[PDB]
Design a protein around this nucleic acid. Sequence first.
DNA 1: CCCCC
Lengths: 88, 550, 174, 174
Amino acid sequence: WINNSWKFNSEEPLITKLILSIRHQLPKEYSSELLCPRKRKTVEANIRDMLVDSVETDTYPDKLPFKNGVLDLVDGMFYSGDDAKKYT
Amino acid sequence: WEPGFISFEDAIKRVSKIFINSIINFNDLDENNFTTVPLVIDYVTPCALCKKRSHKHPHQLSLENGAIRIYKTGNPHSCKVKIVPLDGNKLFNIAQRILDTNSVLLTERGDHIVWINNSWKFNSEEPLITKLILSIRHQLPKEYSSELLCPRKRKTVEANIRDMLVDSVETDTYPDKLPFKNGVLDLVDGMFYSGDDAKKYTCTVSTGFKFDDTKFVEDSPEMEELMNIINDIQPLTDENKKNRELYEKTLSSCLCGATKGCLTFFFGETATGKSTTKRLLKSAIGDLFVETGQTILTDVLDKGPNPFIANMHLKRSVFCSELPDFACSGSKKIRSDNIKKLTEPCVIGRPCFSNKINNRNHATIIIDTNYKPVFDRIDNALMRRIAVVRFRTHFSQPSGREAAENNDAYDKVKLLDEGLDGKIQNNRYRFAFLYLLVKWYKKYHIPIMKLYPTPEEIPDFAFYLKIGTLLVSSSVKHIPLMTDLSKKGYILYDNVVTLPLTTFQQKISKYFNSRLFGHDIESFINRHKKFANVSDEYLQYIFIEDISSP
Amino acid sequence: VETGQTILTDVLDKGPNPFIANMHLKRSVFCSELPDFACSGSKKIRSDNIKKLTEPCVIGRPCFSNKINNRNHATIIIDTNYKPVFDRIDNALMRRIAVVRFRTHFSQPSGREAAENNDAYDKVKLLDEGLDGKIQNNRYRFAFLYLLVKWYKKYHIPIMKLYPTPEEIPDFAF
Amino acid sequence: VETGQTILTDVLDKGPNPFIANMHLKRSVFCSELPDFACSGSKKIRSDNIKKLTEPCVIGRPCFSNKINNRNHATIIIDTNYKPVFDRIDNALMRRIAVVRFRTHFSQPSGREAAENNDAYDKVKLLDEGLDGKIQNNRYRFAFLYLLVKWYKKYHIPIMKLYPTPEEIPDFAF
DNA sequence: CCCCC
């Protein structure tokens, strides 16, 4: 989930892009570890070993995804930010 | 401070750790109170600075050359100065600076493109990011510049640059531009740009050779010589006025970087300037040109892997040769579907076993041949998607000069020069030819670019053009006219004037034959004729001869 | 997504088929300028692929990949100037086609005299040379999206099911 | 470099073709052992397969390789006995062909009378059984090279070009 | 692997 969208790529998994893009969201002492690529690789290895269960994506048949947010079809309230995270 | 050192609270926690004992001014300390306020330490244990039970005086902090020095206040002979440096990953700062200079971009296809030496470059299997990283170190603070001389440091800062780029971009979006290897030439204003002024137009595919304004001039011996060559190639005669205008217009279309709607063929006999035109074009537009086989028109374009279209990507003019002459059986004809989809703005074709299906198409496809091509299918959709150039001049060696004058196809015969081939190998006519091409582009430079088909040149277009001017569909306008239509030979069914098979064929038997055109007639009949009964089968086609008559 | 008429003129499984394995999760791929069957030498449109292209699962793998199951969210619109013919017609093929006709005209002023004397069009209007470049620059992206939203509203039924229209097709006449 | 007759018997594009990708920059290559066309049963030699062997670049790729452009400095010469026959002879093929002829034979003593009285030989001599051993061990390598450079100095005009001589092909009489 | 079939 980088800048309000569920990107996924195969040749370049983006988990290191995410880790570098989430460092402003953690305690201020943590936010300087994530400037060294070796430590981001370590964090990614931990993450990858951490999540076991898989999920189902695009399970709601009536929402349009845009680059900046999901547009609800029934109501019409264009959801942005975290409120679009709920709909993968 | 300077914004690149360290987050303040990180340094504060660092000094709290170094004092190895709770500090009473932990909450009094601010950003301002730096080199004046004393720092009070309640030495519950011996001081870690000097291994004594306590200190006669507190400690004070100083900032110099990126270090926060620790020292005692007074006579610190039995004390030692400690320094903590404030350098927040020098390599991340350099990565940020290179990034903000806007020279590495992530494209929509997943390929990074870097700006080296006044031209956008990219390479899928061998990334060029570190070539740039080394190339640019001259434009950084004179302390950063020597960090990025060790290859491991360059690869670390490249890892950072490739983690910073999350958004993609779009390339080659200005069809009215011509790139080079040193700058982009603006066609609209006749002006050449370089440096940062060329960086904006993200023009990847370049002609591969530098531009020098010393050659893009109106007058030159090269100009007059190449003008004579072009005149001898396509004379400026009135009978060639349409052919010459078409040649000039179809030659400029390769410059514009958008999709083209019609195709142009260089039909012609041997030794008529076809090779000269192709090689002059190659010497002028350089790497924009590409050569590929004739399987595109003959073999299914989808098939499997096919680099013949994978290299069509962004090409602004592609030539193909050696059409497998069709008047004799043995070679698959030029496909109709293959030649219809060469005008969609994104032609479908995948590389040698790769998943990049979509390929952008700015190509003006030209193919050279000695014979009028024949289509397995001719349709209205094809009549709008074909053109042909004819050359009626000969460069002849003196040995065959006598036979040359006895040929009908050679309206003008000259002496072949062995200097043309070598001279166009060294590309002396390159820049003069670009100058005349730019002149022609300005000649037809209205904000719309469009190429129309040429149905008059093809001899295979006669019948489908003929029936348009000789046959009109039966309509309600002709219903109250069946009184005199019955005497002609038509029969009225469900308020439609139809024509039975034999009478229609014998009325056709005065316009075009049944031996040569028999396949055409039978195809038209079994594709267009309707049914009235098992006994009587007719077609709702009315000749204009009976309509015009009273 | 962009594709030609190969999907309607070949076997969809074949071997490695990235051209149909690419529509995984998409909802729009087109079929325009169909390969006219009026002459003998052009393959007709089958009835197995049409039967395949209506299920929640599609069988086919891409290049440089092994997975064969893609989720069908796709809508396809076919268009050609003629009425296509099919090699095989039965009950199954009935529910998998809908057809709409337009008879609207625009052409350059030099072709107006030949424009007004033909029965292939229903109304006489002139050609606009600016709309092509305007839609080339997405001048109608958000607006047409607004229109699409309004049209989704006009049929926003809790259940949505596409339907066929066999009465337009002349193959189904008999 | 040497190669088979697959150059003159099929299409060089197809799939991978190292028989054509290995011609890159070589200055001499031949093709022999032709499928004689006096008896039907083989596809006639492609006439384009002469046109593609004249353009300063040829098309073909190695196995598992991407590059498609190929450089062509080569001299290609055909060595056979029977007059060639082409599927379609036009203005393209006539200038891309010239015939050189051998009017000498060398024979073993056993069959001396057979060749000595043949209308295709203006001379018959003995066959040497020592040339092959000497020539395989590069005896005349530098002597032959010197003779070749002298011949080059014979015709080193500003542009090396070869003139076709169509007077020998019997198919061009019509 | 692409190729082969």
